Design a protein around this ligand. Structure first.
Ligand code: ATP
Ligand code: ATP
Ligand code: MG
Ligand code: MG
Length: 1349
């Protein structure tokens, strides 16, 4: 090796020894270092074995022949030079390793081999170099090399084709080149360019990325962690995601090395402008190194993104499973908002970290490399500069710690907000009926303001950290130079170091974010590890032995939580098989607690409970999913028409199906809001009955149905002559009409078994229950999320800009422009201006500091803008959602509304401001580069348009697909939330019916759809990026080829920078365009039709408007949607002032539709209501709802303080609230509570019994107490003693106000002056109850089934 023949001569020729040693050691060596490592992948990852094909054999045979040929050389050498022995033998054995490797790759099922192809490429290049040398030299050993080269070339061509396999994702069958360049998606790219992409065009998820192949692994690792240990979530994380992620370390290291090597080649090339061969070889080397850098970096990015997506899938699945197995105490502790945050944006924090977590070691690697270069270029003086960086470590770290705390608080606040929103979604009908939309809007606004203040402080600290990190290189430069002068600096020596500082700045300009991502991910890990470590109920607590007493209990002390006192005190009873059991009692005595204790939903302090046989449970509050009635009754069961029809007919559900539009196939709504209370209860009971279980725990299944339907159901389903006659049945009921039929009656008083026996046994004991008995007192309703088809409207960008404000936007743009101008001036000053040294070295520092402050400036200007816009975008949304009518919440499932408030809002909060910042930075960088290359060589400006033009085209070609993918991702994420909500609403039902596995599979399917939408998005980013970077690399080599041909310079180092800036301007613009989809989806609800104006100023009623309360319907036809039949066809009532009127009728007749129409919840289809000579159709919405009270059918208590539930407006004094609780017969219960009125109600009020929730509704009705009271079955799930107490207080407090009472208990309506009988939506018997009884009509019959005659 000497420079005369290798570099100095115009003939590019290697030396003979170099040819025979290094050029042969390179490829053989590559396979030797990779071979061992490759067994790891070949072993850990398997896909079967490929069959015997001609291609595989062709490759194997050529591997055998190639080895022979190489050993044939050793034979001829055996037949002086030392290299003529070792080299042929080494090549032969590495060749024997190559053929063995394709053999084992066949065995392990790999169609395209990256190793073989790259290995053959390197061998080919080495052979090409020797080939050219051997053909320039000119039989004996040359012909062996020609044979070797031809065989190697054919082997390389063969290695490109993909072998046979052992809406599929093309990556599973793509060739090696296709996957290294992400070509397997280009088909969807052009498709997505001709028509908007839909979910149908999207490919099915890869097997490795599928939820049921990812979540289980994480669950198993977590279970092992808990078995061996507090359990550290981080441990299971890398024990679950490192085996695949660690290859990104190799890709990152290779990319770092080659991205450092590239600029060296650039500098040598620009120094070159020596014969033309040197320039051609240098440009080819730069080109191939750049292309390899892009490919390797981009595989690294794909690995990080796929690992992050798998992390999100695993986190969502684990959260779902834990929520399924969670205990009630932990479920109360970890609110629904917290679970929604964990599964919605907590894995987003992990997703981002994935990309930066491969930099935590890369940034200090380049930092220490530049530091060593500084040491060798300037001596030990640089250690002083190190000190500065050292003193920059704690402060930032300290701030990071502070930021962490903020994030924690921020996250906590977010949970609260989401939890509150969930309550608003669940009790929206009650919220609007009570005119409480404004109060809860203000509550959510206060929570959001607190959360945004915390986020603003966190953004301030992040801006300070970014500022100090951006000013650190310049301060280090100045400190090092000042220490160095006190031997002398050389103008060249001084400035060969300034560039090193510009290189070191890159890392110090990402640690600002790597730190933020790590802090957010650490907070997320903490929240998720705390959730996954929550106490879980065990099925082994209840000895659920398969099918001599069906249910036996021995001294059970069940408690809802360990901290709280036990609810069940010494429970002991034994129910024989097939025995009808009624659990009677007053409000809040643990009857539903007893049933949930038999379901293992209650923590057991001590006892022995054995429940034998399958359990079928019906919750007092019926849980209904979005599936139709047939799928609700089936509940994932095989359809048997003979039994399904019998169950439907027996449960008195047939007439409701007759009056339903599509019968039993019509969609039923997210929460059963389509159905009535009685129909909901009947559907839940029929679902339990159809599932043939051995034990049926029925909790008030006939409380919300009339006497006739209740008797029909009991005789045909529950009673001794019903379908359930052979099953043990625990019937928790308050009605005592069916007690004589009961085989065993258990009285639950104070939480314990006060009395046990039959009706004839308890009527002779002469006890408390004896006194109680003596006293006798398809359609497709829901609309799924829709993805917009087209460019996002510029109105969305305007909405995000006008929310930020003119001043903030102008200041941010000015600071961006000033920062990039200062940076350009500094860099340009260094480039051209190169004693003046200290003075110029000071200018570099001065401009540099002037840059950092501006970097700080917009960092504190965009972020606060992100606080402003998120403060507006949410508020309008919070307004837009509430102002929307009840029909909107009916048709929109509670996964779109949660999506806007959880994930799209999070994207608006944090992602969009940062992405806007990086878009403005890239755009101004491109403008500055355009100015730079315009001032220099103005003749080149002719190529300024077309260059940008082509880039523009690529940008367009990409967004037309990319947006849709993002849109589809959001549209694919809305259902998942819904499922969680549903799963969170009916956890007890799912656990009791043992349908946990089916719901787990449904959640896995929904997450699989979401990732089917999300994975093509990241693959699209990679594909676009490869092409964009390749465009640049083919303008670097091209400008380089052109410049070398026209040598006798900086057009290249200008062209490369402009192409890189344009590539990262296109990528950023695509990112901003995709992120604006979040604002588009938030604004989607703005155009949705809303309710009538809340307050009509002109048509305001008098202050004392309902003073008479003379409600007068004219016809008031009611139609929920303009696709169904009327439910209030031509009713004419003339309710007088202060008239006790009772709207009684059959279940599902339209009684509560009257109440919904009185409040203008549903606009009148035909007719009007003139209350006190004032038409409500004309009155303001609040002017109507604030002057009419209602006690809703479904008692919902929003999570929070009990006093907050009684009046969220907080306009009643605590003394008055105490009085209102006293007339509700709840004073004793609230007073024995440890927290008194500040008692925290659970999510949806589950902390209280439904009787106590009805009492709370009555108490808040007493609090309002206007001249119109609507009693929508207030006495529905309360005992007879409480029932009469409620009626007596109403009879007293509501004595001079018009009251419209809908009830199935006719004994509460005989005192009413006159009643409204409803059958199917028409005015039936109409008059005084005594007159109707004389008429002997339908009211008489209803009183007959009620036992009142
Ligand atoms: N939100 C809704 N959308 C569409 N149809 C509905 C809706 N709510 C109820 N219905 C239908 O209207 C009819 C009457 O329902 P409504 O709410 O008036 O019953 P109800 O009189 O309150 O019954 P119950 O006696 O059980 O309280 C039924 O056919 C029911 O399925
Ligand atoms: N999730 C919960 N957290 C805390 N306490 C609860 C919870 N669920 C029920 N309780 C308490 O259990 C007690 C009894 O509730 P349960 O519903 O069993 O009463 P009940 O007498 O059957 O009610 P009802 O008369 O309405 O049928 C009440 O003190 C209630 O507050
Ligand atoms: Mg109950
Ligand atoms: Mg009703």
């Amino acid at each position: 090796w000497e420079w005369n023949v290798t570099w100095n001569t115009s003939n590019p020729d290697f030396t003979k020894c170099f040819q025979n040693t290094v050029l042969v050691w390179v490829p053989c060596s590559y396979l030797w270092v990779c071979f061992p490592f490759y067994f790891l992948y070949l072993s850990h990852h398997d896909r079967g074995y490929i069959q015997m094909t001609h291609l595989n054999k062709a490759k194997t045979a050529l591997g055998f022949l190639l080895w022979i040929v190489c050993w044939a050389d050793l034979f001829y050498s055996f037949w002086l030079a030392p290299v003529f022995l070792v080299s042929p033998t080494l090549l032969g054995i590495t060749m024997l390793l190559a053929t063995f490797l394709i053999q084992i790759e066949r065995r392990r099922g790999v169609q395209s081999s990256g190793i073989m192809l790259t290995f053959w490429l390197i061998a080919l290049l080495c052979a090409l170099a020797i080939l050219r040398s051997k053909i320039m030299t000119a039989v004996f050993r040359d012909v062996t090399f020609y044979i070797y080269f031809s065989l190697v070339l054919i082997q390389l061509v063969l290695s490109c084709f993909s072998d046979r396999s052992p809406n599929p994702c093309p990556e599973s069958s793509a060739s090696f080149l296709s996957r290294i360049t992400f070509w397997w998606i280009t088909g969807m790219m052009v498709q997505g360019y001709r028509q908007p992409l839909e979910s149908t065009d999207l490919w099915s998820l890869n097997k490795e990325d599928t939820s049921e192949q990812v979540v289980p692994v994480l669950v198993k690792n977590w279970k092992k962690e808990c078995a061996k240990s507090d359990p550290s979530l981080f441990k299971v994380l890398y024990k679950t995601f490192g085996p695949y992620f660690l290859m990104s370390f190799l890709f990152k290291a290779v990319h770092d090395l080659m991205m450092f090597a590239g600029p060296e080649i650039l500098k040598l090339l620009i120094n070159f402008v020596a014969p033309e061969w040197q320039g051609y070889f240098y440009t080819a080397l730069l080109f191939i190194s750049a292309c390899l850098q892009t490919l390797v970096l981009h595989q690294y990015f794909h690995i990080c993104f796929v690992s992050g997506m798998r992390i999100k899938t695993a986190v969502i699945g684990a959260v779902y499973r834990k929520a399924l197995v969670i205990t009630n105490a932990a479920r109360k502790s970890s609110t629904v908002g917290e679970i929604v945050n964990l599964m919605s944006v907590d894995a987003q924090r992990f997703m981002d970290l994935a990309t930066y977590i491969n930099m935590i070691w890369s940034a200090p690697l380049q930092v220490i490399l530049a530091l060593y270069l500084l040491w060798l270029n300037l001596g030990p003086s640089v250690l002083a500069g190190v000190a500065v960086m050292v003193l920059m470590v704690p402060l930032n770290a300290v701030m990071a710690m502070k930021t962490k705390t903020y994030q924690v608080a921020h996250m906590k606040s977010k949970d609260n907000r989401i939890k509150l929103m969930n309550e608003i979604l669940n009790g929206i009908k009650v919220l609007k009926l009570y005119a409480w939309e404004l109060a809860f809007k203000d509550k959510v606004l206060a929570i959001r303001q607190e959360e945004l203040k915390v986020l603003k402080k966190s953004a301030y600290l992040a801006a300070v950290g970014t500022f100090t990190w951006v000013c650190t290189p310049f301060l280090v430069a100045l400190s090092t130079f000042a220490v160095y002068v006190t031997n002398i600096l050389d103008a060249q020596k001084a400035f060969v170091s300034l560039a090193l500082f510009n290189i070191l700045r890159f890392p110090l300009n990402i640690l600002p974010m790597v730190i933020s991502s790590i802090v957010q991910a650490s907070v997320s890990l903490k929240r998720l590890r705390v959730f996954l470590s929550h106490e879980d109920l065990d099925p082994d607590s209840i000895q659920r032995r398969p099918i001599t007493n069906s249910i036996t209990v021995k001294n059970a002390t069940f408690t809802w939580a360990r901290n709280d006192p036990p609810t069940l005190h010494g429970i002991t009873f034994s129910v024989p098989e097939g025995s009808l059991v009624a659990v009677v009692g007053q409000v809040g005595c643990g009857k539903s607690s007893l049933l949930s204790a038999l379901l293992a939903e209650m923590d057991k302090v001590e006892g022995h409970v054995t429940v034998k046989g399958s359990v079928a449970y019906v919750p007092q509050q019926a849980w209904i999913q979005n599936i139709s009635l047939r799928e609700n009754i089936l509940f994932g069961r095989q359809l048997q028409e003979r039994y399904y029809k019998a169950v439907v007919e027996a449960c008195a559900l047939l007439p409701d199906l007759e009056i339903l539009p599509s019968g039993d196939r019509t969609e039923i709504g997210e929460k059963g809001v389509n159905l009535s209370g009685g129909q909901k209860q009947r559907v839940s009971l029929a679902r339990a009955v159809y599932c043939d279980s051995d034990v049926y725990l029925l909790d008030d299944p006939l409380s919300a149905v009339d006497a006739h339907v209740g008797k029909h159901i009991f005789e045909n389903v529950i009673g001794p002559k019903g379908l359930l006659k052979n099953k043990t049945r625990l019937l928790v009921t308050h009605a005592i009409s069916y007690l004589p039929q009961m085989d065993v009656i258990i009285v639950m008083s104070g939480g314990k078994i006060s009395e046990m026996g039959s009706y004839q046994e308890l009527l002779a004991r002469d006890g408390a229950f004896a006194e109680f008995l003596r006293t006798y007192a398809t359609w497709k309703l829901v609309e799924a999320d829709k993805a917009q088809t087209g460019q996002v409207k510029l109105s969305v960008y305007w909405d995000y800009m006008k929310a930020i404000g003119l001043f903030i936007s102008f200041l941010s743009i000015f600071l961006f422009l000033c920062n990039h101008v200062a940076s350009l001036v500094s860099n340009y000053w260094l480039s051209l201006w190169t004693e003046h040294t200290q003075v110029r070295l000071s200018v570099y520092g001065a401009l540099g500091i002037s840059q950092g402050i501006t970097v700080f400036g917009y960092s504190m200007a965009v972020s606060i803008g992100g606080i402003f816009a998120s403060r507006r975008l949410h508020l309008d949304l919070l307004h837009n959602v509430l102002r929307s009518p009840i029909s909107f919440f009916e048709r929109t499932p509670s996964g779109n509304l949660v999506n806007r408030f959880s994930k799209e809002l999070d994207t608006v909060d944090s992602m969009i401001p940062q992405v806007i910042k990086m878009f403005m930075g890239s755009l101004f960088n491109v403008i500055g580069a355009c100015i730079i290359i315009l001032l220099a060589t103005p003749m080149a400006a002719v190529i300024i348009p077309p260059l940008g033009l082509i880039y523009f085209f690529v940008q367009r070609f990409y967004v037309a697909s990319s947006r849709q993918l993002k849109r589809l991702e959001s549209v694919s994420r809305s259902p998942v939330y819904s499922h969680f909500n549903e799963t969170l609403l009916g956890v007890s039902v799912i656990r009791a019916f043992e349908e946990q596995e089916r719901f787990i599979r449904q959640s896995d399917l929904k997450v699989d759809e979401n990732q089917k939408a999300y994975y093509p998005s990241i693959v699209a980013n990679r594909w676009l990026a490869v092409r964009l970077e390749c465009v640049g690399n083919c303008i670097v080599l091209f400008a380089s080829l052109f410049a070398v041909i026209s040598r006798h310079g900086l057009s290249v180092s200008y062209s490369l920078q402009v192409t890189t800036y344009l590539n990262w301007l296109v990528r950023m613009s695509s990112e901003m365009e995709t992120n604006i989809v979040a604002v588009e989806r938030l604004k989607e609800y703005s155009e949705t039709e809303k309710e009538a104006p809340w307050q009509i100023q002109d048509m305001a009623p008098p202050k004392d408007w309902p003073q008479v309360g003379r409600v007068e319907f004219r016809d008031y036809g009611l139609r929920y949607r303009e696709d169904l039949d009327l439910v209030l066809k031509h009713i004419n009532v003339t309710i007088d002032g202060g008239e006790k009127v009772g709207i009684v009728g059959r279940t599902g007749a339209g009684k509560s539709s009257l109440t919904l129409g009185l409040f203008r919840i549903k606009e009148s289809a035909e007719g009007e209501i003139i209350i006190d000579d004032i038409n409500i159709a004309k009155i303001g919405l609040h002017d109507l709802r604030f002057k009419i009270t209602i006690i809703p059918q479904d008692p919902v208590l929003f999570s929070g303080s009990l006093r907050m539930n009684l009046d969220p407006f907080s306009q009643y004094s605590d003394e008055e609230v105490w009085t209102s609780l006293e007339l509700a017969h709840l004073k004793g219960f609230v007073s024995a509570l440890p927290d008194k009125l500040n008692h925290e109600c659970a999510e949806g009020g589950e902390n209280l019994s439904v009787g106590q929730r009805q009492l709370v509704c009555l108490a808040r009705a007493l609090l309002r107490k206007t001249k119109i009271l609507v009693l929508d079955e207030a006495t529905a799930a309360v005992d007879l003693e409480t029932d009469d107490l409620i009626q007596s207080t109403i009879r007293t407090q509501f004595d001079d106000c018009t009251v419209l009472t809908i009830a199935h208990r006719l004994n509460t309506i005989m005192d009413y002056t006159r009643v409204i009988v409803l059958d199917k939506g028409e005015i039936q018997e109409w008059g005084s109850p005594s007159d109707l009884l004389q008429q002997r009509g339908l009211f008489y019959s209803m009183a007959k089934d009620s036992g009142l005659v």
